[PDB]
Enzyme design. Structure first.
Site, PDB file in Angstrom:
ATOM      1  N   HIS A 152       0.831  -1.202   0.000  1.00  0.00           N
ATOM      2  CA  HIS A 152       0.000   0.000   0.000  1.00  0.00           C
ATOM      3  C   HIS A 152       0.867   1.253   0.000  1.00  0.00           C
ATOM      4  CE1 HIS A 152      -3.639   2.328   1.665  1.00  0.00           C
ATOM      5  NE2 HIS A 152      -2.632   3.147   1.931  1.00  0.00           N
ATOM      6  N   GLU A 153       1.890   1.286   0.873  1.00  0.00           N
ATOM      7  CA  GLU A 153       2.762   2.459   0.955  1.00  0.00           C
ATOM      8  C   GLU A 153       3.546   2.673  -0.325  1.00  0.00           C
ATOM      9  OE1 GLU A 153       1.815   4.194   3.293  1.00  0.00           O
ATOM     10  OE2 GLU A 153       0.957   2.688   4.623  1.00  0.00           O
ATOM     11  N   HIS A 187       1.557   4.246  -3.052  1.00  0.00           N
ATOM     12  CA  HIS A 187       1.421   5.700  -3.027  1.00  0.00           C
ATOM     13  C   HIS A 187       2.499   6.359  -3.875  1.00  0.00           C
ATOM     14  CE1 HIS A 187      -1.984   6.375  -0.455  1.00  0.00           C
ATOM     15  NE2 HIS A 187      -1.482   5.752   0.600  1.00  0.00           N
ATOM     16  N   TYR A 223      -4.524  14.291  -2.684  1.00  0.00           N
ATOM     17  CA  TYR A 223      -4.882  13.504  -1.493  1.00  0.00           C
ATOM     18  C   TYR A 223      -6.012  14.156  -0.683  1.00  0.00           C
ATOM     19  CZ  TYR A 223      -3.915   9.793   1.919  1.00  0.00           C
ATOM     20  OH  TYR A 223      -3.934   8.703   2.778  1.00  0.00           O
ATOM     21  N   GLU A 281      -6.293   6.286  -2.267  1.00  0.00           N
ATOM     22  CA  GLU A 281      -6.319   5.269  -1.212  1.00  0.00           C
ATOM     23  C   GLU A 281      -6.725   3.898  -1.751  1.00  0.00           C
ATOM     24  OE1 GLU A 281      -4.267   6.269   1.529  1.00  0.00           O
ATOM     25  OE2 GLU A 281      -5.637   4.584   2.004  1.00  0.00           O
ATOM     26  N   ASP A 291     -10.249  13.337   7.916  1.00  0.00           N
ATOM     27  CA  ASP A 291      -9.520  12.365   7.104  1.00  0.00           C
ATOM     28  C   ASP A 291      -9.368  12.865   5.668  1.00  0.00           C
ATOM     29  OD1 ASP A 291      -8.251   9.846   6.407  1.00  0.00           O
ATOM     30  OD2 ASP A 291     -10.224   9.029   5.869  1.00  0.00           O
ATOM     31  N   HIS A 315      -9.759   7.585   3.500  1.00  0.00           N
ATOM     32  CA  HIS A 315      -9.712   6.187   3.948  1.00  0.00           C
ATOM     33  C   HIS A 315     -11.101   5.611   4.204  1.00  0.00           C
ATOM     34  CE1 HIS A 315      -5.700   7.756   5.153  1.00  0.00           C
ATOM     35  NE2 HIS A 315      -5.287   6.565   4.761  1.00  0.00           N
TER      36      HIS A 315
END
Ligand SMILES: CC(C)C[C@H](NC(=O)CNP(=O)(O)CNC(=O)OCc1ccccc1)C(=O)O
Ligand SMILES: [Ca+2]
Ligand SMILES: [Ca+2]
Ligand SMILES: [Ca+2]
Ligand SMILES: [Ca+2]
Ligand SMILES: [Zn+2]
Length: 316
Positions: free
Chosen positions: A142-143, A146, A157, A166, A226, A231
């Site tokens: 996931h990271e 990005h 974002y 996301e 958020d 998310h």
């Protein structure tokens, strides 16, 4: 650092033994020269100054508790590199074999992980909400995803573009977890979330609403928490992706699944050819339909299933 490529061994966050690519020059460093221009893992030493120091070890054995987050960040970055190269013919996050950098032991009790614009960063968790987050292959992927997004579509974002950002990270995090094929699922973060609680996850792609996230556009969050729900509203796109791959009938709309490999091809093409920094959910549907058309033809089952899945989640 300049040195010679070596192979160490250690234990990850969950207690499993794995071999790691290292570099010897006086010390053994967490520097894998076998992938692109390298994968480099750093010790942030419980501080917030980045990256910290390139991880050095005297004996090429990484079995200490303090070593475990570094072992997994390093190893799972390698798996994620291999997925992008072998499956999508993409060389690292920039497409030109950029060095991949990660820091572990970031801050104290830190219940998160992130891409900071230049590198991956992993907290250790507080031991109750999380154990060290690099123990989750889906989280690591996931990271790194990005970074892929930032170099390609560049989705801003916040709000819908941020929820797409996301979802892209959850989708490819999951596809990397399936690629490695050790206990794969459509849940996010199950290996590192809430060590005291079995069977939960940070998010679910198959049933986002299990953890409170929307599974239909009519249930989207419209407030400011958020970053505008990045998310939260990702659940709508995660559910569509799950349906494309696996099929199902959702709010009365039936989707014929086409499998993970085709899901990944369609979304990778959408990400890299059609999405832009400001794309919204409707524009993602159009990008996914066009991508499936390019790959499989306008009259294909694949195109029909993309349309059904977006219909099922209320995105036109
Ligand atoms: C309890 C949490 C683990 C849940 C969630 N995080 C994730 O699912 C994974 N991390 P991620 O999605 O990569 C954060 N990433 C994030 O918040 O990006 C902000 C940023 C922008 C620019 C530079 C540095 C950071 C969250 O943050 O609410
Ligand atoms: Ca050692
Ligand atoms: Ca799993
Ligand atoms: Ca998972
Ligand atoms: Ca748990
Ligand atoms: Zn994220």
């Amino acid at each position: 650092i300049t040195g010679t490529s070596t192979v160490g061994v250690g234990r990850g966050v969950l207690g499993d033994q794995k071999n790691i690519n290292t570099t010897y020059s006086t010390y053994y460093y967490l520097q894998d020269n076998t992938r692109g221009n390298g994968i480099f893992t750093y010790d942030a030493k419980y501080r917030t100054t980045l990256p910290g120091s390139l991880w050095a070890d005297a004996d090429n054995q990484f079995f200490a508790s303090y070593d475990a987050p570094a072992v997994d960040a390093h190893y799972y970055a390698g798996v994620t590199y291999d997925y992008y190269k072998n499956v999508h013919n993409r060389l690292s996050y920039d497409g030109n074999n950029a060095a991949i950098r990660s820091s572990v032991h970031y801050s104290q009790g830190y219940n998160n992980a992130f891409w900071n614009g230049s590198q991956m960063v992993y907290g250790d968790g507080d031991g109750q909400t999380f154990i060290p987050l690099s123990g989750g292959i889906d989280v690591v992927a996931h990271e790194l995803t990005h970074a892929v997004t930032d170099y390609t579509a560049g989705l801003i974002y916040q709000n819908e573009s941020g929820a797409i950002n996301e979802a892209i990270s959850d989708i490819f995090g999951t596809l990397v977890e399936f690629y490695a094929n050790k206990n794969p699922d459509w849940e996010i973060g199950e290996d590192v979330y809430t060590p005291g609680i079995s069977g939960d996850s940070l998010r679910s792609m198959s049933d986002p609403a299990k953890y409170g996230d929307p599974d239909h556009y009519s249930k989207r969050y419209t407030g400011t928490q958020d970053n505008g729900g990045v998310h939260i509203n990702s659940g709508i796109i995660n559910k569509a992706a799950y349906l494309i791959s696996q099929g199902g009938t959702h709010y009365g709309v039936s989707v014929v699944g086409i499998g993970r490999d085709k899901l990944g091809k369609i979304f990778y093409r959408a990400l890299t050819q059609y999405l832009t920094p400001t794309s919204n959910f409707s524009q993602l549907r159009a990008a996914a339909v066009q991508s499936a058309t390019d790959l499989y033809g306008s009259t294909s089952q694949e195109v029909a299933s993309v349309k059904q899945a977006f219909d099922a989640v209320g995105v036109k």
